[PDB]
Design a protein around this ligand. Structure first.
Ligand code: SF4
Ligand code: SF4
Lengths: 532, 535
């Protein structure tokens, strides 16, 4: 009467559909043995250091075919908007710079996430987390990446860990004698777009579910650098199980799941509703960041079993920095997923803005154009993001003035990766503007931050502030951190708060920096029609 | 390459939970054998041990509680600052635990989703079929005890059926050092699981003024729908949304109680007792109380601060409910050990109502209820029609296809509930209320067709229900949430399946009750018992 049925039953559990390359001479780190009648694998734990180092190096310079195919699709589709094509060409060009293995594809080299599946008869000595972390530590310390992890000394006092540790190390116990891995370099921006909804049976009908999807996709906006790999999970045995599934779905880790359910509650991919998600994404008009058709590369929809009283729902994306890498260790050595090393094969109206003027002259010029105008910035930018804004607001709350460097130049929300030797700058693309939304009106009423430069749609309070104070929000393309570093950024200098690491205040000299006018000084928002 | 220093995110001082009392399963040392391979100590474990362990865990956990849960109910009774309703609810739950301690009726009708957190040592060898053997033990517990099958299978996106055995379970088996097998078993109720919330916040939250205002705002959204007093867990930060939500779940089980209380430059997690005190103050000063106004919104609080990506600040909020059900266990060279729960809950008990006859026309019951303000405690005697999520959806679907609202929705108040299995020789199994909010979208519709004028469930409801009851002369009665066993033993005299038997526990039932306690939460006049504390 009892029948065991696993929730997840992929037809390709070992990811044979993926191409792997064996690390040279890595068979010296493994040995096949037979203990108590069973085949087992002795693994030198140094193999985990080697594997994690190479994984978190390669993943910042190369992409999977399905990601690159999406960018070419946006360029070649006659139905794509001009802005769709412009963004996809920029991102593909950026991937070509990153393939040089010097500049990472994004300044946000992400949180290191390891999903490991150690077989019952795979023996490493048991110090897997330490040895994996050292390999991650090696990748971020000795390559031109970024230290993005923020340690809490108490509830509110924070510091950068200086090495991109700690990693998220999810090590699972599974049958057999191999060691299987999924490594993810997960950007903070795309991580912030992982959403959990507590729903009910009233959602579970075609009309309600479609309306739900139309409503929730808009809340993703453009803040996580679309085109998106959109993942949606309906159901789950718990919120954390739902959120883990939607993360893995976004990495296309569950692509070989069955496509039908059964009376035992197994998970399944729903291709009909993936098609509906894609239809909503295209008809939304949100586009590849600035209006059009290519809001999404592709969609994954996974239906999960549920408690009768529960319906958790997960929504997540993978961003332009689509960075995951499969790997395994077996009796033959260390195998790591082979990424596309020649992205160039996938490649088939502007207003010059002189910033080397008083900020009021720059504001006047910007006032002459409507939202949606593409501009090219030439001059000095002051760079500040989350913590700097918080420190500055605190200074003003204690009677101190708004710093002079918040009034001379447009404010670029960004945090750079490390500078390669002999380079003007490391990868240096924008960060999400919405996170600074609560400082705009305050700073503008005190005579600064009249012009901001970042990526993503912003809230109505920012539109109101720019109209009230004669301000502007310029949207940079999100994602192309390397080509911006290589072509646009000529000089980088730390201005204030050097203890903050990448979150210090910087002053940079730029040339031909592309941006769109998203919010003008008149109440207009380039996203007001597609993200209403 | 020596600047490197590994720091585990979680560094409990009591990783093996030595502070917890364990009992050895008698003769269970016959399932393990110590061996030596390549100079290293390893433990051979017969997988039958995982069936035995999971079966025992998911049986005991439905009849007994931990001391810190029971002490909270006693605190609510003995605190001079506790409201009268606080004391009434806590006494009811304690009396309910005494019935559950009889090992026949489970403490709650929602015997939950079976969740296993397992940590298998590298040299702990089970044969590798841990999931199957664990699931068989879970299957044994729910099949052979008076529990409930609560799991819903999706045949397609929208076609659903009950799995009939409370499987699948959630099985999270981790690879860890050593040769032992350590476990946390959780029987997680659906209602409290629904009150696990994820917020995507920013650095602008990370100051005392913003964080306190955030906690005040978010705690109210928990409401009374997950049967408080709550164990409230709050996690600030995390390396990912799923890691944040996993942590807040574990915090609510007090699994992270021995974490350090200070951070360091390496980003380790820590418990923050100062902000735990702040959560308790917000909870107590909220006036929400133990379901019906007062001080005891929360038993206790856990606040864990996590590291974060500079651009990120995920926040998790979750509760453990009155059916606070978790059990620790481990397997080692000595056998199977399982956490010892409190078997005499009665030692925690220390040493004005309107009678409503339901055996009348529903319009006369509405008239009587109209005489009283919200907050009036009533005592129900008569027939209830029982229907929840799927039945309500099926009935609305029928009306959308031109069929009338069924007559059995108009004759009697509607009790939102789904019973556990009936013990032999009992009138009914555990049979407490379901969260009312989930049916909010049907009330106005059903009332416009002459039914669902009186509903009986637990939890605060949305404004549309208040409007509907005012427009249609309706009432919402809040039962005490949680005391499913004492309701079954003392109040429910007859249970009969009326319609949709294929839905299992979600069928439409007709039950006869006596002395069923409830509060008037929404009257027919626009008044809501929760309008001041949950505004
Ligand atoms: S591509 Fe955009 S969303 Fe992704 S890591 Fe880079 S900046 Fe954050
Ligand atoms: S006590 Fe309340 S919230 Fe907890 S499982 Fe029972 S009905 Fe659900």
């Amino acid at each position: 009467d009892f029948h065991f049925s696993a929730i997840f039953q992929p037809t390709d559990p070992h990811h044979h559909q993926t191409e792997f390359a064996k690390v040279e001479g890595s068979e010296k780190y493994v040995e096949e043995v037979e203990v108590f009648g069973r085949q087992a694998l002795k693994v030198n734990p140094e193999a985990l250091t080697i594997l994690a180092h190479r994984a978190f190096s390669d993943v910042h310079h190369f992409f999977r075919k399905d990601h690159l195919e999406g960018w070419r699709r946006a360029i070649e589709d006659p139905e794509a908007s001009d802005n769709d094509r412009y963004v996809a060409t920029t991102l593909l060009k950026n991937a070509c710079i990153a393939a040089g293995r010097v500049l990472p594809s994004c300044q946000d080299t992400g949180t290191a996430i390891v999903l490991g599946k150690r077989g019952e008869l795979c023996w490493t000595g048991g110090e897997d987390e330490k040895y994996l972390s050292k390999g991650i530590w090696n990748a971020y310390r000795y390559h031109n990446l970024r230290y993005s992890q923020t340690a809490a000394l108490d509830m509110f006092k924070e510091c950068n860990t200086g090495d991109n540790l700690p990693a998220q190390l999810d090590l699972l116990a599974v049958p057999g004698s191999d060691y299987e891995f999924l490594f993810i370099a997960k950007g903070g921006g795309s991580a912030n777009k992982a959403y959990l909804y507590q729903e009910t049976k009233a959602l579970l009908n075609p009309k309600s579910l479609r309306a739900f999807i139309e409503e929730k996709l808009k809340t993703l906006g453009t803040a996580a650098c679309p085109p998106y790999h959109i993942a949606l999970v309906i159901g789950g045995t718990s919120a954390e199980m739902t959120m883990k599934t939607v993360k893995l779905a976004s990495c296309r880790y569950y692509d070989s799941l069955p496509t039908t359910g059964d009376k035992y509650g197994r998970a399944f991919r729903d291709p009909e509703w993936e098609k509906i998600v894609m239809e909503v994404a295209q008809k939304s008009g949100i586009g590849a960041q600035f209006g059009g058709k290519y809001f999404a590369h592709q969609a994954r929809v996974i239906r999960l079993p549920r408690h009768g009283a529960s319906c958790p729902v997960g929504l997540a994306v993978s961003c332009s920095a689509d960075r995951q890498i499969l790997a395994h260790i077996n009796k033959s050595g260390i195998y790591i997923e082979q990424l596309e090393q020649n992205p160039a094969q996938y490649l088939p109206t502007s207003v010059k803005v002189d910033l080397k003027r008083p900020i009021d002259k720059v504001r006047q010029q910007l006032s002459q154009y409507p939202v949606g105008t593409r501009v090219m910035l030439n001059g000095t930018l002051i760079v500040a993001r989350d913590i700097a804004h918080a420190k500055i607001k605190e200074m003003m709350d204690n009677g101190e003035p708004l710093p002079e460097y918040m009034k001379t130049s447009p404010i670029y929300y960004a945090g750079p990766a490390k500078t390669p030797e002999g380079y003007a700058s490391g990868s240096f693309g924008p960060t999400t503007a919405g996170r600074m939304d609560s400082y705009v009106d305050l700073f503008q009423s005190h005579g600064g931050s009249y012009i901001t430069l970042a990526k993503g749609n912003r809230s109505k309070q920012v539109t109101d502030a720019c109209k009230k104070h004669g301000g502007f929000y310029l949207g940079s393309i999100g994602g192309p951190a390397a080509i911006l570093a290589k072509d646009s950024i000529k000089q980088v200098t730390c201005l204030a708060f050097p203890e903050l690491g990448m979150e210090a205040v910087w002053k940079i000299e730029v040339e031909d920096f592309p941006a769109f006018i998203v919010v003008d000084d008149k109440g207009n928002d380039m996203y007001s029609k597609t993200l209403a």
